[PDB]
Amino acid sequence: MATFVELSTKAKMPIVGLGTWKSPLGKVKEAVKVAIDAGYRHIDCAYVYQNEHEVGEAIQEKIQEKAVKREDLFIVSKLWPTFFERPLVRKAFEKTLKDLKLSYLDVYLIHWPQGFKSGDDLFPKDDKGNAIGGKATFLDAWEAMEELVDEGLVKALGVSNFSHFQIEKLLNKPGLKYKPVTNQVECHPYLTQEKLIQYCHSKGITVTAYSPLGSPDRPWAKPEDPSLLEDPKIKEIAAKHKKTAAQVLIRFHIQRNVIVIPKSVTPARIVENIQVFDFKLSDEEMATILSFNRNWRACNLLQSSHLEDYPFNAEY
Ligand SMILES: NC(=O)c1ccc[n+]([C@@H]2O[C@H](COP(=O)([O-])OP(=O)(O)OC[C@H]3O[C@@H](n4cnc5c(N)ncnc54)[C@H](OP(=O)(O)O)[C@@H]3O)[C@@H](O)[C@H]2O)c1
Ligand SMILES: NC(=O)[C@@H]1C[C@]2(NC(=O)NC2=O)c2cc(F)ccc2O1
Ligand SMILES: [Cl-]
Numbered sequence: 001m002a003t004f005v006e007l008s009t010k011a012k013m014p015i016v017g018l019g020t021w022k023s024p025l026g027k028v029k030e031a032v033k034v035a036i037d038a039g040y041r042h043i044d045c046a047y048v049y050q051n052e053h054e055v056g057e058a059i060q061e062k063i064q065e066k067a068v069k070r071e072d073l074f075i076v077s078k079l080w081p082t083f084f085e086r087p088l089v090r091k092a093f094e095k096t097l098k099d100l101k102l103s104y105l106d107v108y109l110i111h112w113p114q115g116f117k118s119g120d121d122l123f124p125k126d127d128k129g130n131a132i133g134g135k136a137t138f139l140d141a142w143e144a145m146e147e148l149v150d151e152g153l154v155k156a157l158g159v160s161n162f163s164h165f166q167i168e169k170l171l172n173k174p175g176l177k178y179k180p181v182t183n184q185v186e187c188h189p190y191l192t193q194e195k196l197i198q199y200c201h202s203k204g205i206t207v208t209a210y211s212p213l214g215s216p217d218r219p220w221a222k223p224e225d226p227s228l229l230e231d232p233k234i235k236e237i238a239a240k241h242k243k244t245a246a247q248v249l250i251r252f253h254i255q256r257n258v259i260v261i262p263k264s265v266t267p268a269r270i271v272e273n274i275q276v277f278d279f280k281l282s283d284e285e286m287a288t289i290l291s292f293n294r295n296w297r298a299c300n301l302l303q304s305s306h307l308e309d310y311p312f313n314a315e316y
Contacts, residue, residue, distance in 0.1 A: 017042030019263030
């Protein structure tokens with residue numbers, strides 16, 4: 001019901017998907033079922049979210065119950081930066097694929113460009129609190145991920161939280177086999193990503209907007225932080241369309257041809273968040289919303305700001 005953004009592979013990626021970060025065990029399975037019933041086909045997952053097995057249970061049940069076919073679903077997961085060494089890329093992917101109970105993934109993303117030390121910890125740190133970097137780089141990881149496409153286990157690869165310099169470094173890699181089909185980055189009216197979107201699109205790379213509602217449930221949210229859902233100017237535009245602020249925040253991306261993945265575990269909101277194909281923001285409304293840019297990020301992975309490929313030191 002969601003319309004599509006065409007990838008460079010000619011595959012069609014549904015323009016609205018369901019986000020699953022912070023969706024707890026015991027709720028995410030029902031959230032995915034409700035989403036599929038409401039017409040969602042794209043689900044955004046990750047190893048680090050530690051809930052992929054319940055997403056997998058939901059998908060498996062909906063398929064068997066004949067509510068949906070696998071070919072019509074678009075499932076994305078991500079390789080966490082502690083798994084950049086070749087044997088670990090395969091191990092991590094295999095765990096993700098097993099948890100999701102799938103025979104293939106539609107897109108597999110590098111979750112962050114900066115590599116972390118391999119071992120048992122997901123966030124390895126020294127005795128100061130800083131993140132310990134890894135031995136392998138995202139270029140090393142990419143080479144192992146390409147093997148997954150060669151073998152038919154993943155349809156396409158992509159990146160997440162990459163700056164244009166990092167995409168350039170990937171596109172320029174000697175022996176490159178597969179180009180990224182998307183860059184999944186934070187995007188919303190307070191972080192409009194104009195230059196990065198322009199860059200990605202110029203290279204035939206789509207953009208997937210994460211935290212489009214401003215991630216109000218992020219653990220580190222502070223009272224004084226900007227709040228998109230409460231922005232009276234967003235609400236003003238919404239009320240005009242008899243829509244919610246959330247629906248305007250989602251529709252904003254659709255009209256820039258940017259894929260968007262709002263997260264909810266509340267059935268009414270899951271349904272609400274995909275009722276976004278029955279109205280249209282005017283050119284004036286789009287320009288007003290675009291003017292709200294504050295260069296504000298909900299997600300910074302601050303503790304990894306000192307690593308070589310920390311992505312947010314670049315302008316874009
Ligand atoms: N690649 C990356 O590094 C990265 C980083 C961040 C996020 N992501 C992906 O992007 C997804 C979305 O981002 P996010 O989870 O950070 O935050 P988000 O989608 O911007 O916001 C989620 C929050 O908004 C609430 N909400 C959802 N729909 C609502 C509605 N219609 N009205 C009012 N409140 C609503 C949710 O509450 P309830 O759930 O309680 O309903 C939840 O607290 C993630 O789940 C993840 O899949 C990726
Ligand atoms: N601090 C950050 O920017 C990231 C954001 C992030 N959410 C996300 O979907 N991808 C992320 O890497 C995240 C997810 C986690 F499971 C744990 C921490 C965490 O922090
Ligand atoms: Cl991950």
